[PDB]
Amino acid sequence: SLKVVSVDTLCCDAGWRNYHFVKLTTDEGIVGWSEFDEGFGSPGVTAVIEQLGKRLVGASVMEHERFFAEAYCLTRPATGGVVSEGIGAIENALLDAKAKTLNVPCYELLGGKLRDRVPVYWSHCPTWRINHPKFFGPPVTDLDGVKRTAEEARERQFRAIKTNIFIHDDGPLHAWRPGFAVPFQPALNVDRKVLRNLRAHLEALRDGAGPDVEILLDLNFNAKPEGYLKILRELADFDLFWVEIDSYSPQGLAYVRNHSPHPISSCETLFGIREFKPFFDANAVDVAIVDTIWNGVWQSMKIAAFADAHDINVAPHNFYGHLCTMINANFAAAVPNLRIMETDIDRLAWEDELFTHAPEYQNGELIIPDRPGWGTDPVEEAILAHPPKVMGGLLQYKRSE
Amino acid sequence: SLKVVSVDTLCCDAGWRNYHFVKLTTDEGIVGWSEFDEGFGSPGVTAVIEQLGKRLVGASVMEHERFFAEAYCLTRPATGGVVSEGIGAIENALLDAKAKTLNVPCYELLGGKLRDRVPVYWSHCPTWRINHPKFFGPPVTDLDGVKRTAEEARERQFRAIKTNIFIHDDGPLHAWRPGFAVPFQPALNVDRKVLRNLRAHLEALRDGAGPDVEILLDLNFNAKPEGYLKILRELADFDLFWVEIDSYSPQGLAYVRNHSPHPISSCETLFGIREFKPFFDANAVDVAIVDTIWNGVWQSMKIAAFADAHDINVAPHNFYGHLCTMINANFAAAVPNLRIMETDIDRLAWEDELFTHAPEYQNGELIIPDRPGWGTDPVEEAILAHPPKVMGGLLQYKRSE
Amino acid sequence: SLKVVSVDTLCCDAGWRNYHFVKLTTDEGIVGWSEFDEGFGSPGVTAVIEQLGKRLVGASVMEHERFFAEAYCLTRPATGGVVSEGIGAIENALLDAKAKTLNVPCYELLGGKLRDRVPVYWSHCPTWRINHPKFFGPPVTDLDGVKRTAEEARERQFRAIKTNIFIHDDGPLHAWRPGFAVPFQPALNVDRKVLRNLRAHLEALRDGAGPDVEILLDLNFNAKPEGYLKILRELADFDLFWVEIDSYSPQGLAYVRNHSPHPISSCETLFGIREFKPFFDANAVDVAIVDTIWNGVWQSMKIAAFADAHDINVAPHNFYGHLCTMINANFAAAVPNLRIMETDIDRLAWEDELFTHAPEYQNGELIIPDRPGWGTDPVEEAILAHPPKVMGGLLQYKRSE
Amino acid sequence: SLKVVSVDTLCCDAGWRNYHFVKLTTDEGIVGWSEFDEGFGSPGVTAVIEQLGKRLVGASVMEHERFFAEAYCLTRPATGGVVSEGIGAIENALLDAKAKTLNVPCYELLGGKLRDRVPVYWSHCPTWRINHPKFFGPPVTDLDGVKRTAEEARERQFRAIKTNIFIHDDGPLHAWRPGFAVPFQPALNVDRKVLRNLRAHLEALRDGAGPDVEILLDLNFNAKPEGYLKILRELADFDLFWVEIDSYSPQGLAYVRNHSPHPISSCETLFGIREFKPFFDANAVDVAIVDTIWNGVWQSMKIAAFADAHDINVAPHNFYGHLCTMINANFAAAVPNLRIMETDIDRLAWEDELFTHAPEYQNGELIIPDRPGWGTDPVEEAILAHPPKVMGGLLQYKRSE
Ligand SMILES: O=C(O)/C=C/C(=O)O
Ligand SMILES: O=C(O)/C=C/C(=O)O
Ligand SMILES: O=C(O)/C=C/C(=O)O
Ligand SMILES: O=C(O)/C=C/C(=O)O
Ligand SMILES: [Cl-]
Ligand SMILES: [Cl-]
Ligand SMILES: [Cl-]
Ligand SMILES: [Cl-]
Ligand SMILES: [Cl-]
Ligand SMILES: [Cl-]
Ligand SMILES: [Cl-]
Ligand SMILES: [Cl-]
Ligand SMILES: [Mg+2]
Ligand SMILES: [Mg+2]
Ligand SMILES: [Mg+2]
Ligand SMILES: [Mg+2]
């Protein structure tokens, strides 16, 4: 019949956060999967999906843009954010199911592949070993460990690494994340302490990385334009692949970029061409980060095309489980204007239990798989062996505090 | 202690949709309430509130902007929409509790009152009698009933009424709501049928209203700029108080307004100064609709001040239960630049059972109450006597179809 | 009755200028106070207050935004400047009275507090010891005294200091203030003499401050854009917390900022969102100075919210008596987007006689008090023991000349 | 010596407001005069003048731009409004004294005259006979009196008349002045009642004026852009010389003008090229009103030149005593780009007692005099025979209410 018979959500432990999944089944017995997240400031996504999936039952699994169009209509007033994440999660499950029904990898729905491998950067490096050492080891607790982590990246043939903001000289090593309320300093002022610690951290990372490995710096939402300018001027003499700055002020981000000696990336939290547009019109970015897990991969192809017309390359936002990596792999396979792909190389001890297939890296690149659908399936029995905790993510840093 | 002890949500039947409430209790035994909605495209608000309220327990009930600032940080990546609605619902409960603790009406927290009564328009008139006749009577099923409803508004001393788009000459009277997927025609084209039915409907309404009662026309998201221009040109010779058009294109809405012989209102679905700004910068509106139930009343005071600087008057979005009306009443009491206040005069048969106090109207104006807090409390026993159904609102029109 | 019974003004000696106060009494016997200034280019404020306060008698003390709205109407043609200062002074007295009536600190009217302490900078350092040595000692008369003053700031645990422009190598140490007619050189040209003396002064200050204490430079209105650029280029290699430039040309200030290696602050002389707007639209500032003594604290909350939407942090303008400090303390307690708070640490020998309570500093921060109202009351008997002189401020530098 | 020996202010009764004067005496015994106003929203001007005139004593009477430059410096922070009115009043007294010293009319200081007579409009017609009937008769209390007043204007050979907003069909004839708080309706909404009364009033005026006399409509600050558009659309079919709209939103006024079938005038409350600039840049006006009594005539020549470069004609703001008329006459004599000159033809019973010379009109034009100075002197004995009342103007309408 090609009809969708069911849309369900599943959830499992990922240590300091949960993983979430959409499971969609068709009349033919094909199962399409996606992975989504609630911990990155996104409570409610499951509820959105539960409501919207009810309308999908009985509809064609082939008609994903029909479903998008209908869902957009039905949630038009509160579009964006958690609503749009729910829609994107369902879209990604539909795509998997459609590809499987046609016996092709998902990239065959996206224009075909135009590359077989994708260069990555090792993300949250050493951020995960500092911030979640119970889950990702070896723990990093000082500048020497920062250096050693970059050395490890170099030895393992990764070509780039991304770090965040850390305070080394004021007690135990800790993250500076005021944009996410740790500490609670909502003006997000940047002082000498921040600047000297950024310098110390990046000098140690560079010492370990050597001169060839690229260093990316993510500042997230942790400053105002004033403070971002102060950081960029302080770090004017560093060799940075990019400086990543999230902002809801296209004019403010553009001002910062105009005064930056480094490439600027942004946009990981934005939805649709509509939200990216003011930033591109303002010349706000060198690189656009596209969260295809949030937007849905089909919507993300639209965003990538829009970026392409502005001669802006895009990078997928990818810092979740293996299924997200494979989802993003298919996007990266198909998009001409691809800057690079993010991935976390630090993995949970039980990561590989949760999925049928693990991503394969060789010489700093991700190998794009050629199996029907995204390239990996969550394993239901394994999900149930790792029951979820309460919401973590941005909420559990604040508990740890 | 002034500490928040608990944050709970409650839900009850409102016929074709549910009402939702936040109940916040302090160490002193004061209860603060707000009302929120999920049916207007907003699945997930309860989940957001459930997560965010956990951080609030143990904090001061007096420190509402502290809570806002923290909540904004913790949900920064997925801000807007359902996330921001959850934050606004909690804010409105905090304000009620704070006002009650200080033994003052909520307007005493908002600058004091500057008016004792507020002119209203009778909203969803005759929209509710056409679309939800099981709940709001007498049913309207033809042009004569449209006329009689406007006559009723005139007799009852209401000074203004707002209608939507209706098709009269193609079978049983029915709403034209393609922007919300009834019918599913996602291009939102406007054809002759739409235009001739708009004319027929508005002529009947004017016939009943007489020459003094004002007529507002809400087009919601039911067209593209092309179609909005076609409607405005068709209706160029009508006397309309305003034409309401929701748009996520500030440049497109500005173009439409620039070519409109009628005042244009918009913005009911927007959050924060940040989202209103591009519309004001573009000269997109005569009147800004502010949903204080969504934004929170404190955030809405910021939006009203911003509008004031642009010499734009604001109107509260108010089409829910009595508590929402009283919340909006307090906002309307305090804001200098107030255009008018929306209210639904068609009420559910059990509406007054659900709340301690009902809004009082005299000569087309709402009387602003002077009780501590918002002016009415939901009644827990009554809530439980009217158990909720599954989500309705935008989802149940589509079931009816 | 909650009625205002009287509005009076009081004035006392502050050495080289006077302090002024509004005293407002309610039917319940509550007294609300504010402090205002005439010496900073503002003759006439008392007269404005005397006229406007007459309309306030008999009105509710609770209805401050009503009074603002009415006063704005009654003075609409000549709004801004001295008129708006009079309105702001009355507003601040109303707020004190309202808070006292409700038995809460003023920050409880402003959203609640979100911080308990506020970092300050020591303003007019060493400006007051150079320019008014009869009142603030030890006198500073050379570069060594400049250095020692910065050392003192460091020892006393202040984290930042702000200086102005001084000429050291052309006779006795003297201020360069052509924007305020000392000397009378109304083109405000910047020559080599200015630049070399700025360098000499700042080098001495840095020598004393050490590397951790931040140095702010206030240039007031003492140049044209051409000259501001010359100063910024000369000082490109200094570590400056900000460079403060007052301008009535948003396009000119924006040009200067665009070419500045230092953060730029401005706006201390502006009134309302309306006046700040062209500067924010032009990307003219890193930091917005808000004079809440001038604007009124309620109006200033509107300005702070507007700034917040542009991701601009604000700093209160605070260089008067203890009551102004406490007024600003309450604003600083409540505003999320707070850059820093100005305060003068050099005090008059009789300062503490004039007020019931003095501000308390610890480790470079101001402690926010928790008494009803602003936190300090002027003492009538003490005011009368220090009778005012003729207007000083900007007028008495010109006498000294 | 050419030194200024004294600067004094004088004040006398003008019925519902006071007239104010600056009297400046030189070492040679020459007396220079100006007239200023406090009642049009401007409490404090006398205090400004009292302070600033102290610096002028001992300076050259010839050096008026020196004094301006110095005064601007000394009041830079609170410039505009009442401060700038005080400066302008002194400037106008300096000009009179300088012209008298050189034995020439003031226009000889302003480029020489380029016309001998100036067409006027009869302002506040029938506004003064409606609003201040105790002082200006015959009283106007109905539409017939409105018609008769326009007939009188026609018979007396005036070519144009200006009215304001009046309500005829809701009790005794009364002014609609919500922008000045009568009534207190600070949203400034425009409803049907306003529109139908505007129509009725203007139809009666046109009936009396006949087809040749021009009708100007002044809306002051009595609406928001939304409401101004509603008025202009309602009155689209009237023949109006201009519609006058005061606004502090150059973008809002520009929007209104862009949609106006009538010429738009504005700017009467603005100071300096700096304040006019955003309006001219925005294409906000057909005609710029320049208040030379406020700005000073020398500053106003700068404003007129600026307007000239934009091909905008200017009109003086002139609705005070005979000295203001003569001040404006000299400006009008000299400015090429002169639209028309305002004047009040309704005079107080004692007007001519207060001044040495009265303005002379012939065939709808003002004859420019050729006496040294402005053309008339206030008479000290007469001033003292008409002692002032408390401040009236905008404050006394509110008493009458
Ligand atoms: O994903 C990041 O780059 C940072 C996350 C955080 O600070 O929570
Ligand atoms: O609230 C309205 O105006 C329309 C709602 C709808 O068509 O669903
Ligand atoms: O307050 C200041 O920064 C400077 C004042 C002055 O030079 O008069
Ligand atoms: O001068 C006018 O045109 C109006 C003045 C007023 O309404 O007070
Ligand atoms: Cl989580
Ligand atoms: Cl902070
Ligand atoms: Cl619902
Ligand atoms: Cl369609
Ligand atoms: Cl002073
Ligand atoms: Cl000079
Ligand atoms: Cl007066
Ligand atoms: Cl109003
Ligand atoms: Mg990032
Ligand atoms: Mg609407
Ligand atoms: Mg300053
Ligand atoms: Mg006028």
CB C332 within 8 A of CB C118: yes
Residues with Cβ within 8 Å of residue D381, at least 6 apart in sequence: none
Site residues for ligand 2, CB cut-off 6 Å: B 164, 177, 180, 218, 220, 319, 394
- Verify whether the Cβ–Cβ distance B308 to C65 is below 8 Å: no
CA distances, A73 to each of B221, B309, D192 (Å): 9, 33, 37
D121 and D80 in one domain? Answer: no
Nearest partner of D52 among D106, D9, D1, judged by Cα: D9
Please check whether residue C237 lies inside any domain of the structure: yes
Block residue for tokens 């006498």: C399
Nearest C-alpha to atom 1 of ligand 1 is from which residue?
A: A124
Q: What tokens does C267 get?
A: 């706006």
Nearest partner of B206 among B198, B217, B197, B215, judged by Cα: B215
3-state secondary structure chain A: CCEEEEEEEEEEECCCCEEEEEEEEECCCCEEEEEECCCCCCCCHHHHHHHHHHHHCCCECCCHHHHHHHHHHHCHHHCCHHHHHHHHHHHHHHHHHHHHHCCCEHHHHCCCCCCCEEEEEECCCCHHHHHCCCCCCCCCCCHHHHHHHHHHHHHCCCCEEEECCEECCCCCCEECEHHHCECCCCCCCCCHHHHHHHHHHHHHHHHHHCCCCEEEEECCCCCCHHHHHHHHHHCCCCCCCEEECCCCCHHHHHHHHHCCCCCEEECCCCCHHHHHHHHHHCCCCCEEEECHHHHCHHHHHHHHHHHHHCCCEEEECCCCCHHHHHHHHHHHHHCCCECCEEECCCCCCCHHHCECCCCCEECCEEECCCCCECCCCECHHHHHHCCCCCCCCHHHHHHHC
D119 and D59 in one domain? Answer: no
Contact residues on chain C for D187, CB-CB shorter than 8 A:
none
Q: What is the DSSP letter of B163?
A: E
* Number of alpha carbons in the 13 Å side-chain half-sphere of residue B245: 29
Alpha helices in C192-339 (DSSP H): 192-209, 225-234, 250-258, 272-281, 292-295, 297-309, 322-334
Cis peptide before C138 (omega within 30 of 0): yes
Cis peptide before B183 (omega within 30 of 0): yes
Q: What is the DSSP letter of D80?
A: S
Identity of the amino acid at B261:
P
CB C6 within 8 A of CB C57: yes
Contact residues on chain D for C44, CB-CB shorter than 8 A:
43-45, 47-48, 82-83, 86
Q: What tokens does B266 get?
A: 């918009």
* Spatial separation of the C-alpha atoms in residues B153 and B345, rounded to whole Å: 9
Q: What is the DSSP letter of C178?
A: G
Q: Which of D78, D249, D268 comes nearest C82 by C-beta?
A: D78
Please check whether residue D398 lies inside any domain of the structure: no
Nearest partner of C229 among C195, C272, C178, judged by Cα: C195
Measured in Å, residue C336 CA sits from the centre of ligand 6 at 6
CA distances, D29 to each of D6, D22, D61 (Å): 10, 15, 12
C380 and C316 in one domain? Answer: no
B45 and B172 in one domain? Answer: no
* Spatial separation of the C-alpha atoms in residues D112 and D336, rounded to whole Å: 11
| Interchain CB contact of C277 with B (< 8 Å) | yes
CB C201 within 8 A of CB C168: yes
CA distances, A183 to each of A397, B258, B312, D382 (Å): 10, 47, 38, 73
Instruction: Tell me whether residue A372 is exposed, middle or buried, using C-beta atoms within 10 angstroms of its C-beta: 0 to 12, 13 to 18, 19 or more.
Output: middle
CB C148 near ligand 3, within 6 Å: no
Please check whether residue C270 lies inside any domain of the structure: yes
Please check whether residue A391 lies inside any domain of the structure: no
Strand B174-175 vs strand B166-167: parallel, antiparallel, or unpaired? Answer: antiparallel
Residues with Cβ within 8 Å of residue A399, at least 6 apart in sequence: none
Residue B39: domain span? 1-103+376-386
Taking the CA atoms of residue A175, residue A181, residue A185 and residue A186 in that order, the dihedral angle to the nearest 10 degrees is: 130
Measured in Å, residue D184 CA sits from the centre of ligand 12 at 7
Please check whether residue B393 lies inside any domain of the structure: no
* Number of alpha carbons in the 13 Å side-chain half-sphere of residue A168: 20
CB C304 within 8 A of CB C347: no
CB C220 near ligand 3, within 6 Å: yes
Query: Coil, strand or helix: which one is D285?
Result: coil
Strand B214-218 vs strand B174-175: parallel, antiparallel, or unpaired? Answer: unpaired
Block residue for tokens 């007529």: B215
Backbone angles phi, psi at A161, to 5 degrees: -140, 150
Q: What tokens does C279 get?
A: 């500067």
Q: Count Cβ–Cβ pairs < 8 Å, chain C vs chain D.
A: 156
C381 and C369 in one domain? Answer: no
Helix (H) or strand (E) holding C217: strand C214-218
CA distances, C263 to each of B349, C260, C312, C339 (Å): 62, 7, 12, 12
User: Among B306, B330, B338, which would you mutate to test the C interface (most chain C Cβ atoms within 10 Å of its Cβ)?
Assistant: B306
- Verify whether the Cβ–Cβ distance C82 to D44 is below 8 Å: yes
A123 and A18 in one domain? Answer: no
* Spatial separation of the C-alpha atoms in residues B327 and B345, rounded to whole Å: 16
CB C63 within 8 A of CB C55: no
A137 and A70 in one domain? Answer: no
Residues with Cβ within 8 Å of residue C264, at least 6 apart in sequence: C242, C243, C244, C245, C253, C256, C257, C284, C285, C286, C287
CATH at residue C112: 3.20.20.120
Altogether, the residues listed in chain C come to a count of 401
Helix (H) or strand (E) holding D155: helix D143-155
Block residue for tokens 């009033």: D201
A112 and A217 in one domain? Answer: yes
Q: Is residue B197 annotated as involved in ligand binding?
A: no
Tell me how many degrees the CA angle D337-D360-D148 measures, rounded to the nearest 5. Answer: 90
CA-CA-CA-CA torsion sign (A261, A262, A263, A269): negative
Query: Coil, strand or helix: which one is D184?
Result: coil
Locate the ligand 1 atom nearest the alpha carbon of residue A394 and give its number. 8
CA distances, D90 to each of A329, A349, D86, D106, D326 (Å): 76, 84, 6, 15, 16
**Beta strands per DSSP E along D27-96:** 31-36
* Spatial separation of the C-alpha atoms in residues D292 and D324, rounded to whole Å: 9
* Spatial separation of the C-alpha atoms in residues A60 and A367, rounded to whole Å: 32
* Spatial separation of the C-alpha atoms in residues D89 and D94, rounded to whole Å: 9
Q: How many domains does chain C have?
A: 2
Q: Which of D48, D221, D278 comes nearest C44 by C-beta?
A: D48
- Verify whether the Cβ–Cβ distance B395 to A74 is below 8 Å: yes
CB D17 near ligand 4, within 6 Å: no
Q: b vs e for D1-15, b when ≥16 Cβ sit within 10 Å of the residue's Cβ? A: eeebbebebbbbbbb
Query: Coil, strand or helix: which one is B253?
Result: helix
Q: Is residue A197 annotated as involved in ligand binding?
A: no
Structural method: X-ray
Query: Coil, strand or helix: which one is D142?
Result: coil
| Interchain CB contact of D65 with C (< 8 Å) | no
CATH at residue B84: 3.30.390.10
How far is it between the farthest Cα atoms of chain B?
A: 65
CA distances, A176 to each of A223, A401, C365 (Å): 11, 12, 21
CA distances, D300 to each of B235, D258, D268, D272, D289 (Å): 47, 27, 12, 7, 10
D160 and D84 in one domain? Answer: no
- D272-281 and D250-258 are packed helices; what angle lies between their axes, rounded to 10 degrees? 40
CB C374 within 8 A of CB C326: yes
Q: What tokens does B242 get?
A: 């305003």
Backbone angles phi, psi at A392, to 5 degrees: -110, -125
Alpha helices in D57-80 (DSSP H): 64-74
CB C110 within 8 A of CB C334: yes
Q: Is residue B23 annotated as involved in ligand binding?
A: no
Taking residue A171's Cβ as centre, other Cβ atoms within 10 Å add up to 7
* Spatial separation of the C-alpha atoms in residues D111 and D129, rounded to whole Å: 38
Strand A287-290 vs strand A264-266: parallel, antiparallel, or unpaired? Answer: parallel
Residues with Cβ within 8 Å of residue A174, at least 6 apart in sequence: A130, A166, A167
- Deposited resolution, Å: 1.8
D187 and D40 in one domain? Answer: no
Among C136, C177, C346, which residue has the most ligand 3 atoms within 8 Å of its CB, making it the best to mutate? C177
- C143-155 and C192-209 are packed helices; what angle lies between their axes, rounded to 10 degrees? 40
Beta bridge partners of B373: B105
Please check whether residue B395 lies inside any domain of the structure: no
Taking residue D262's Cβ as centre, other Cβ atoms within 10 Å add up to 18
Q: How far apart are the first and last CA of chain D?
A: 53
Please check whether residue B141 lies inside any domain of the structure: yes
Residues with Cβ within 8 Å of residue A243, at least 6 apart in sequence: A216, A217, A218, A219, A231, A232, A235, A260, A262, A263, A264, A265
Taking the CA atoms of residue D45, residue D51, residue D53 and residue D56 in that order, the dihedral angle to the nearest 10 degrees is: -140
Q: What is the DSSP string of C327-384?
A: HHHHHHHH-SSB--EEE-----TTGGGSBS----EETTEEEPP-SSBSS--B-HHHHH
* Spatial separation of the C-alpha atoms in residues B267 and D298, rounded to whole Å: 47
D39 and D12 in one domain? Answer: yes
Q: What tokens does B343 get?
A: 């209210």
Taking residue C95's Cβ as centre, other Cβ atoms within 10 Å add up to 25
Residues with Cβ within 8 Å of residue A381, at least 6 apart in sequence: none
C367 and C380 in one domain? Answer: no
Residues with Cβ within 8 Å of residue C131, at least 6 apart in sequence: C124, C175, C397
Identity of the amino acid at A288:
A
Backbone angles phi, psi at A249, to 5 degrees: -120, 95
Taking residue B267's Cβ as centre, other Cβ atoms within 10 Å add up to 28
Nearest partner of A215 among A200, A226, A205, judged by Cα: A205
Window 314-333 of A: residues touching B by CB (8 A cutoff) are: none
Q: What tokens does C314 get?
A: 């604000």
- Verify whether the Cβ–Cβ distance A247 to C286 is below 8 Å: no
Q: What tokens does C237 get?
A: 């290699």
CB B5 within 8 A of CB B27: yes
The set of chains that have 3 or more CB pairs under 8 A with B is: A, C, D
CB D316 within 8 A of CB D328: yes
- Verify whether the Cβ–Cβ distance C336 to A247 is below 8 Å: no
* Spatial separation of the C-alpha atoms in residues A204 and A213, rounded to whole Å: 13
| Interchain CB contact of A401 with B (< 8 Å) | no
Q: Do chains D and A touch (3 or more CB pairs under 8 A)?
A: no
User: Among C54, C73, C391, which would you mutate to test the D interface (most chain D Cβ atoms within 10 Å of its Cβ)?
Assistant: C73
Nearest partner of B156 among B116, B110, B209, judged by Cα: B209
Q: What tokens does A56 get?
A: 């999908």
Nearest partner of C76 among D75, D14, D77, D220, judged by Cα: D220
Helix (H) or strand (E) holding C33: strand C31-36
* Spatial separation of the C-alpha atoms in residues B35 and B193, rounded to whole Å: 38
Please check whether residue A394 lies inside any domain of the structure: no
* Spatial separation of the C-alpha atoms in residues A313 and A242, rounded to whole Å: 13
- C81-101 and C64-74 are packed helices; what angle lies between their axes, rounded to 10 degrees? 160
Contact residues on chain C for B66, CB-CB shorter than 8 A:
111-114
Query: Coil, strand or helix: which one is B225?
Result: helix
* Spatial separation of the C-alpha atoms in residues B105 and B119, rounded to whole Å: 20
Name the residue in chain B with its Cα closest to that of A188.
B73
Beta bridge partners of A26: A4
* Spatial separation of the C-alpha atoms in residues B326 and B331, rounded to whole Å: 9
